[PDB]
Design a protein around this ligand. Structure first.
Ligand SMILES: [Mg+2]
Ligand SMILES: [Mg+2]
Ligand SMILES: [Mg+2]
Ligand SMILES: [Mg+2]
Ligand SMILES: [Mg+2]
Ligand SMILES: [Mg+2]
Ligand SMILES: [Mg+2]
Ligand SMILES: [Mg+2]
Ligand SMILES: [Mg+2]
Ligand SMILES: [Mg+2]
Ligand SMILES: [Mg+2]
Ligand SMILES: [Mg+2]
Ligand SMILES: [Mg+2]
Ligand SMILES: [Mg+2]
Ligand SMILES: [Mg+2]
Ligand SMILES: [Mg+2]
Ligand SMILES: [Mg+2]
Ligand SMILES: [Mg+2]
Ligand SMILES: [Mg+2]
Ligand SMILES: [Mg+2]
Ligand SMILES: [Mg+2]
Ligand SMILES: [Mg+2]
Ligand SMILES: [Mg+2]
Ligand SMILES: [Mg+2]
Ligand SMILES: [Mg+2]
Ligand SMILES: [Mg+2]
Ligand SMILES: [Mg+2]
Ligand SMILES: [Mg+2]
Ligand SMILES: [Mg+2]
Ligand SMILES: [Mg+2]
Ligand SMILES: [Mg+2]
Ligand SMILES: [Mg+2]
Ligand SMILES: [Mg+2]
Ligand SMILES: [Mg+2]
Ligand SMILES: [Mg+2]
Ligand SMILES: [Mg+2]
Ligand SMILES: [Mg+2]
Ligand SMILES: [Mg+2]
Ligand SMILES: [Mg+2]
Ligand SMILES: [Mg+2]
Ligand SMILES: [Mg+2]
Ligand SMILES: [Mg+2]
Ligand SMILES: [Mg+2]
Ligand SMILES: [Mg+2]
Ligand SMILES: [Mg+2]
Ligand SMILES: [Mg+2]
Ligand SMILES: [Mg+2]
Ligand SMILES: [Mg+2]
Ligand SMILES: [Mg+2]
Ligand SMILES: [Mg+2]
Ligand SMILES: [Mg+2]
Ligand SMILES: [Mg+2]
Ligand SMILES: [Mg+2]
Ligand SMILES: [Mg+2]
Ligand SMILES: [Mg+2]
Ligand SMILES: [Mg+2]
Ligand SMILES: [Mg+2]
Ligand SMILES: [Mg+2]
Ligand SMILES: [Mg+2]
Ligand SMILES: [Mg+2]
Ligand SMILES: [Mg+2]
Ligand SMILES: [Mg+2]
Ligand SMILES: [Mg+2]
Ligand SMILES: [Mg+2]
Ligand SMILES: [Mg+2]
Ligand SMILES: [Mg+2]
Ligand SMILES: [Mg+2]
Ligand SMILES: [Mg+2]
Ligand SMILES: [Mg+2]
Ligand SMILES: [Mg+2]
Ligand SMILES: [Mg+2]
Ligand SMILES: [Mg+2]
Ligand SMILES: [Mg+2]
Ligand SMILES: [Mg+2]
Ligand SMILES: [Mg+2]
Ligand SMILES: [Mg+2]
Ligand SMILES: [Mg+2]
Ligand SMILES: [Mg+2]
Ligand SMILES: [Mg+2]
Ligand SMILES: [Mg+2]
Ligand SMILES: [Mg+2]
Ligand SMILES: [Mg+2]
Ligand SMILES: [Mg+2]
Ligand SMILES: [Mg+2]
Ligand SMILES: [Mg+2]
Ligand SMILES: [Mg+2]
Ligand SMILES: [Mg+2]
Ligand SMILES: [Mg+2]
Length: 394
RNA sequence: GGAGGUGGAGCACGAGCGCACGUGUUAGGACCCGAAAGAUGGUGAACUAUGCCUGGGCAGGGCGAAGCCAGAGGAAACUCUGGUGGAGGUCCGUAGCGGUCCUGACGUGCGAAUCGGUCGUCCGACCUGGGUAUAGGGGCGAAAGACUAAUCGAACCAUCUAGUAGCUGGUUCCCUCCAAAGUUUCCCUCAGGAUAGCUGGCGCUCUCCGCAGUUUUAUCCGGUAAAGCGAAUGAUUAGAGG
RNA sequence: AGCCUUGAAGCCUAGGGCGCGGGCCCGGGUGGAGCCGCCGCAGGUGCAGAUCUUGGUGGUAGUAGCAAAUAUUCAAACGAGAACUUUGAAGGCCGAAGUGGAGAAGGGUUCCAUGUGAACAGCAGUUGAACAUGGGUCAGUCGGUCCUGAGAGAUGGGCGAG
RNA sequence: CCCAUAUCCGCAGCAGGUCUCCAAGGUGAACAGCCUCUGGCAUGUUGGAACAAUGUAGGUAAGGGAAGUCGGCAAGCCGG
RNA sequence: UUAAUUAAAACAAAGCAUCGCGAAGGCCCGCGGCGGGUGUUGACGCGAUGUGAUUUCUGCCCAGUGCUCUGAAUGUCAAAGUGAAGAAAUUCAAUGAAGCGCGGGUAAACGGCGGGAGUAACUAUGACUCUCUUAAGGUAGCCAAAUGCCUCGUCAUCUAAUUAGUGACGCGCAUGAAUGGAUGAACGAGAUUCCCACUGUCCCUACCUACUAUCCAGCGAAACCACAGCCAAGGGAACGG
RNA sequence: ACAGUGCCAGGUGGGGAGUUUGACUGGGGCGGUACACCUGUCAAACGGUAACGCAGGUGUCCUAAGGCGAGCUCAGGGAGGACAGAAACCUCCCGUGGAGCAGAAGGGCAAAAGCUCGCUUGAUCUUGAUUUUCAGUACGAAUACAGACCGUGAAAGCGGGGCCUCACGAUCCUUCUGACCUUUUGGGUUUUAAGCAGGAGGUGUCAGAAAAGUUACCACAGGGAUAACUGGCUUGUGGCGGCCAAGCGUUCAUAGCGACGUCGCUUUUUGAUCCUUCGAUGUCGGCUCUUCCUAUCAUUGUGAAGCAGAAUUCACCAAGCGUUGGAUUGUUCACCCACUAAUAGGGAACGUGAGCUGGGUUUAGACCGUCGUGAGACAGGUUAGUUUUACCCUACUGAUGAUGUGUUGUUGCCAUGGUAAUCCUGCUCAGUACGAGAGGAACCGCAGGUUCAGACAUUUGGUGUAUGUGCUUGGCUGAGGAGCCAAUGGGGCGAAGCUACCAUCUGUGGGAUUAUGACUGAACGCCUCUAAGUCAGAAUCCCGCCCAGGCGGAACGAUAGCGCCGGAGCCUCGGUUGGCCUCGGAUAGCCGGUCCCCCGCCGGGGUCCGGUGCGGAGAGCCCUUCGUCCCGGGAAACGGGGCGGCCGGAAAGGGGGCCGCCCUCUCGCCCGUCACGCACCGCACGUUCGUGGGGAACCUGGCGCUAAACCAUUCGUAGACGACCUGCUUCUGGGUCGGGGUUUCGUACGUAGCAGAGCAGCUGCUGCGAUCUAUUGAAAGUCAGCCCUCGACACAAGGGUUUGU
């Protein structure tokens, strides 16, 4: 018989199966559709979730209750040291879909990238690309590369660059770089290859990919949470306290007929560590990394037009469980998937951004840099010392 | 003794007895296993029920009965106030005894009734050891058909006894031939029998005229289909002429 | 005038065959002492079942489980072997209505010494209330013994087939 | 000799049952509970490593305060 | 108090009221007797019942069924005895124990305790009247009560809203007087309603601890099993592995 | 002389014993009797034929209503006759039975079978046969006779009951009647008793026991032959929907409704039935959770109104998304309160008890009412009443993994499967359109929210055994200090982590189209959204975005006794027995040339000419194999065979053609001349693709390569275990300790104090004293999963198992 009172089902069947992701680094499932009339540009990037904070800005929203007024907004800090292009991969459109046509690699590949090619770097002899790299040094090999580059011009329709991160500049334990294809959108196929060929072994800073006030998508793997029951995995109603044999369950997992449990019924199992794509996360700031100019370390990348204090984005005591952000970073509005240190794929939007929220221009008045390791109450150590005064340590 | 009818499991020139084999029906344990029951004679009150005999046991508190002392009041009766006193099938509560709820634990348990918290009572119609008495259509019951050795709306043990079962289950090698019925009547008959029918087997009396789930030719029988209702019975519409 | 220690019955056999079949024959192996053909006689004479009887074995399955009562750690000794035995030292618990010291009923040698580590003690054990070989309970005065208790129970007598 | 979370009865070294005697300090009304001395024991028929779900047993919870449920069941408040 | 699903409103109880009995007796046991229990007793006792403290009250009915009392006045009435017929067996008559019939008593014995119509100067009711009628025709009380079908009765109160609760009403299917009626302090691990307080019961879930589960070494069962084990429809012993 | 006892006799005697307490039956019970009979019908023209089928009857009645004879004629009607009339009695006429014959009905009957008289007892005695039911038994009833006695009639005759079809009863026992009856046991007489034959006493459950209840304290043997669920057939009832059109709607049938009638659909109602299940399918409701239907309440896109606007009603495509919080009740159902866009209706074994709960129903205790003598009963109330098992298979959820790609790794494609966003409010439009007024919109834009989904912890909150740091109770270590125990002693605050619409962030684009509105346009000289053709078109659908990623591919790196190129054989697996190396397409039209003309980066259009049952044909084309020899003739000579280079190929990429070479042949093809070869004596598996695929090996030359994976260790971005993410010598690495930062609590011990309420002792001093001030934002902790050090210390160049085209 029909269920007495209507109610929406718990959870979305569009995110099934609720299993551990097969990839740790978020995969770009769909790159932006190429527009041949735009200049050659890259469409994605890799960053690492440093941590969260909040900022003060004045909203510019005509007809809104917060028009001309200051608001406090949470933001996620993603460290984005420049990537290094090391290879090109070309694709051919076939009636069975894009097929990898040809891959070319640069002559020199840093050991961070090579670590990606091994399961035990300690035990290996580091022989990767030791014989390929010779193709760039002899006339017979060189004449074979430009033919490979010429073939990719005749036949390939999609061009991507194999860029990798620079793990030596991060505060992390890992030394193995994250390597990913990035589609080269823009001009003709020939213009894509000349642009990509010129940038082999070169560095591509995040600013060259993304801009201020741009809406982007973050792709990553959520925080794993292990085996979970239906109450926590699916958010079903807890049964009454009197229930015998447990109340953190779904009471009826199906009807007599069909004589099977259906795929649409909440069950226990893995929670978290799911691949997810989130869209429309606005870029609030592309902060510049530390520079040594005239013997001085310039690090006031957390200063604003309305706050001239020389402080970095790092909070007192550093980003908890992450470290210190000393490279370029992207300040995203809101929260993103993953743990601290999680590698996050930054991708340009697949949509046309014509909305007041999407077009709004961000102007920061303040960036909170108090300690997150507790209830921090000082923005800077200079401010803390001036308030507290001398201590017994002094 | 005769004549003529009628009842008999008769005579009318024997066919029986003895033995053996088969089949069928029965009486017996009765093809095998299966009741709930009933009867006789015995063993149990080490559990529990109840009476009796002789022993043991039950913190700390609350309330504050009668009696008594003092002070005040009063003409008397007596009254008021403060103490003392320590009653009670009295109250909170431990040991003990019990077992309300969680409808908790457990539910192939630690346990064939237990465990946790929470609970009832806790000087009495109180709790308990041992001795002793009541024994099965009997006991004992502050009464629930309770208890009477994990057994109780009649214990347990052996025998009668292989109790009876129109009811359930089973019923053991091969080939060959033939091959049903669920219908009639009677039955406290309706899940069963007896009875006729349907089957099989053994033959025997003949044969190389008789018979037939058939037609033909003759000849009867019938009251359904249809038809009729300006024909009987019954029902029924409309005008018309007297 | 059957077969048989020059190998009976039984049992096994990707051996050769026979018969529509019930079955049977022969070859090979194992076995070690009896057995079969034909004419008759006799029967406690043929199994797939009966929640059949008795015995054996599976999958489940190296699975459920070995979770009630706060708790162990260090060093050494013996030893083939040590989370579990002994000693020493720590840290804990029962907390005088005890996890202390003694009895009644019941048990019946479980008591004590030495030995074993087969089986048992639902892991292990160098240990045990297990197994083995030997010991151990001393009374005028502590109980029984005697008294009578509720009660049981002869004789006389009565009843009674007994 | 045991006299009982192992010498007895429950098939067993069974969280059950089974009659008694003696009875320290502190707190406290107290043979209550909590800690300790005398005496006793080795966590109750095993250990190691983890710290998922679901349990069993304990706790805490903003704002509301029975709207839950057959029912305030459960817990909670009160407490000398 | 139902050991082991019911702890209760059930049982008991003091109180109350009946009933039998003066011992060669009442009540009871026993196969049996100069047998036995009450009874080491004696009506302020023993035996058999009902109700269930106190308070207040306990109405009418003896026709029915019981129980009980009186009996030669006296219908029926066994054996035995008496008389007559007959050869006797036998038959017939007369007589007439208890018990039944007959007549009283008795309900704190089992139990029971009506129907129809008309009627007051608006309407409604109908104190009043008529009538049929039984052994009485339900009195004092009480009630949609643990008792009322219709029924979630009607009115009021309690809520925003109440098949719940409480107070009223009462032609009450089918209330009612020791088959006890009405009450009422204290008491209840008894049933029910509301309120304050409290709170994770809930909105709406989260986190933490211990023991498991978990993995490992050792050790290690049991239930159950035709063969088994992916579905849709079909047909089919009318829902197929 | 009674109590008393022994033995008989009568009464009483559920205290106790034994036993019974029918059958049929759309379950049983209650109700009926279809249980023994009879008539009509069913019944299908012999007979027979069932149902709790239909319409009825029977357990009697008759001294005549039996028997005979005779004589008459009935119901009804018409017409006449004093009282007399509708109806009394008399008369005449008609009268086929329309009357009567005991009764139910059917049949039969007119000088009779009816009515009336006269005489009577054939309703008597007796043996057989027969018919009906049937078994060819009994009874009952009936039919023909036969033998006696009779009645009646003049007689023929008729009659042994009723005009025919019903009206009834075994054995045993009792009673009566009959005989010059038999027996009555050793004989005789006599009473008695028993026999034989015929009646009666009765069994209606009628082929014939002698028979009351209750069980909820219940029991056994069974039954799915049989009820209480689901399911199945059916669909009366319930629900929903059409058709006709009398009316309603002021007018007007059909905007919206719709009588009298009628046709359907559904199985979310109840029935009917009894097919499955009684060696058990857990029986109401709620809770929880998913899914599906549409008969659509809301929302999107629409059509019609008795649509001015607003509001509403009818209808279409339509199930994408929603459809709520509560008081009373066990409730389903209902009723109300409140909010809402709306508060639609249903299925899934009346979804869902090894998912729960157990309020109700439905055991055992107990109360009330009614009923019963009672035990007891009650779709009447009330209260208390044990909810068992998963470790098996599958399904499902997650986790390792498996084939096979030579091994291994990085980066990737996507076949397939899933899939998602949703509704409302405010502002503006606008007090505008519309409207007399009242009232009163909409599209575009802007700002928010609801429901849902996916995350996340900067902030606020929650937790907190960091057992971090204070406070604090009882006890314990002689005290101080420092601590511990009280199953987390209690409590304040609290890091990290986890976590809350209880904080924060984010949630998207196309295509074909449905309904509908249209274009052009015939059919059908007009018209027409339709017939051919064409356009716009949506919470629908499909795709995208997003989640997974195949016994599915790809590119690229590195490849340890192994890779590449260049002899005999041996095993094993099979199949096969020439090749076609390509326009695009139309089919009411095609193909090939022609370029002479027009365009274009040699190709397109035109013209012109040829073919078209395609012959520049798949009905086709190419290749064709017996070999060699001698010498001729045609054909080649621009020729055949054999090492270096350049154009060219990517959807799954060419051992094609062409330029050189140094060579090598004038033989290859056709027709002839000339002979030869194992000619194996008629015969199968012959004849290739075939140096086929795969596997071991054995060689024998050249050119080349010297890896990873897994374990172990470590990490914590991960986690039940596996798995997953990481590190393991660049004078560099991680580790440990130390230091610094951050952060929590809140100011340490000691020491000093002329601070301290007081008290004690000594003559102002010294003691005891909770607490107070300074030292002292002090002390203590702080990554175990916080940040930075490069200070100290050691360690680190390792170990095991595998893998080859
Ligand atoms: Mg619904
Ligand atoms: Mg429960
Ligand atoms: Mg923080
Ligand atoms: Mg016979
Ligand atoms: Mg026999
Ligand atoms: Mg009997
Ligand atoms: Mg005793
Ligand atoms: Mg008391
Ligand atoms: Mg008390
Ligand atoms: Mg329980
Ligand atoms: Mg369990
Ligand atoms: Mg007593
Ligand atoms: Mg007795
Ligand atoms: Mg009873
Ligand atoms: Mg037998
Ligand atoms: Mg037997
Ligand atoms: Mg039978
Ligand atoms: Mg009979
Ligand atoms: Mg049968
Ligand atoms: Mg006929
Ligand atoms: Mg006809
Ligand atoms: Mg074999
Ligand atoms: Mg021998
Ligand atoms: Mg024998
Ligand atoms: Mg067998
Ligand atoms: Mg295990
Ligand atoms: Mg244990
Ligand atoms: Mg002791
Ligand atoms: Mg001792
Ligand atoms: Mg062991
Ligand atoms: Mg010993
Ligand atoms: Mg004696
Ligand atoms: Mg423990
Ligand atoms: Mg231990
Ligand atoms: Mg033990
Ligand atoms: Mg709260
Ligand atoms: Mg609060
Ligand atoms: Mg409520
Ligand atoms: Mg509710
Ligand atoms: Mg409570
Ligand atoms: Mg009980
Ligand atoms: Mg109980
Ligand atoms: Mg009485
Ligand atoms: Mg009275
Ligand atoms: Mg009377
Ligand atoms: Mg009455
Ligand atoms: Mg009254
Ligand atoms: Mg009252
Ligand atoms: Mg009331
Ligand atoms: Mg309420
Ligand atoms: Mg009464
Ligand atoms: Mg193990
Ligand atoms: Mg099956
Ligand atoms: Mg009696
Ligand atoms: Mg009886
Ligand atoms: Mg019957
Ligand atoms: Mg016929
Ligand atoms: Mg005549
Ligand atoms: Mg005659
Ligand atoms: Mg006659
Ligand atoms: Mg004589
Ligand atoms: Mg009962
Ligand atoms: Mg019943
Ligand atoms: Mg059936
Ligand atoms: Mg049904
Ligand atoms: Mg009209
Ligand atoms: Mg049938
Ligand atoms: Mg079954
Ligand atoms: Mg089931
Ligand atoms: Mg079952
Ligand atoms: Mg529709
Ligand atoms: Mg159901
Ligand atoms: Mg189920
Ligand atoms: Mg259940
Ligand atoms: Mg209940
Ligand atoms: Mg009951
Ligand atoms: Mg009565
Ligand atoms: Mg206007
Ligand atoms: Mg927080
Ligand atoms: Mg926190
Ligand atoms: Mg101290
Ligand atoms: Mg303790
Ligand atoms: Mg706190
Ligand atoms: Mg906090
Ligand atoms: Mg159209
Ligand atoms: Mg279109
Ligand atoms: Mg469109
Ligand atoms: Mg071949």
């Amino acid at each position: 018989s029909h269920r007495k009172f209507s109610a929406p089902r718990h959870g979305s069947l569009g995110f099934l199966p609720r299993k551990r992701s097969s990839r740790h680094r978020g995969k770009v499932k769909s790159f932006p559709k190429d527009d041949p009339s735009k200049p050659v540009h890259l469409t994605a990037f890799l960053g690492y979730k440093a941590g969260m904070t909040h900022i003060v800005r004045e909203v510019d929203r005509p007809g809104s209750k917060v028009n001309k007024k200051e608001v406090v907004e949470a933001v996620t800090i993603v460290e984005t040291p420049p990537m290094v292009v090391v290879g090109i991969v070309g694709y051919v459109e076939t009636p069975r879909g894009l097929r990898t046509f040809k891959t070319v690699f640069a002559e020199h590949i840093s050991d961070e990238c090579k670590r990606r090619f091994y399961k035990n770097w300690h035990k290996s002899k580091k022989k990767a690309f030791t014989k390929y790299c010779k193709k760039w040094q002899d006339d017979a090999g060189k004449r074979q590369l430009d033919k490979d580059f010429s073939s990719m011009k005749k036949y390939c329709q999609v061009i991507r660059v194999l860029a990798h991160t620079q793990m030596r500049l991060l505060p992390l334990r890992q030394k193995k770089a994250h390597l990913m294809e990035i589609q080269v959108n823009g001009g003709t196929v020939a213009e894509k290859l000349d642009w990509a060929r010129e940038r082999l072994e070169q560095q591509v800073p995040v600013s060259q990919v993304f801009g201020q006030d741009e809406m982007i998508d973050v792709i990553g793997v959520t925080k794993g949470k292990g085996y979970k029951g239906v109450t926590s995995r699916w958010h079903t109603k807890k049964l009454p306290r009197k229930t015998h044999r447990g109340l953190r369950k779904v009471a009826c997992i199906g009807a007599w007929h069909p004589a099977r449990v259906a795929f649409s019924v909440a069950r226990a199992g893995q929670k978290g560590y799911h691949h997810r794509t989130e869209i429309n996360k606005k870029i609030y700031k592309i902060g510049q990394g530390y520079l040594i100019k005239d013997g001085k370390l310039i690090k006031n990348n957390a200063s604003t037009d309305y706050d001239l204090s020389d402080k970095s984005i790092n909070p007192l005591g550093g980003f908890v469980h992450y470290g210190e952000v000393t490279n370029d970073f992207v300040m995203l509005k809101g929260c993103v998937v993953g743990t601290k240190k999680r590698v996050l794929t930054l991708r340009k939007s697949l949509l046309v951004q014509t909305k007041r929220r999407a077009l709004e221009k961000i102007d920061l008045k303040f960036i909170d840099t108090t300690s997150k390791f507790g209830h921090g109450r000082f923005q800077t150590v200079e401010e803390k010392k001036a308030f507290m005064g001398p201590l017994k340590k002094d």
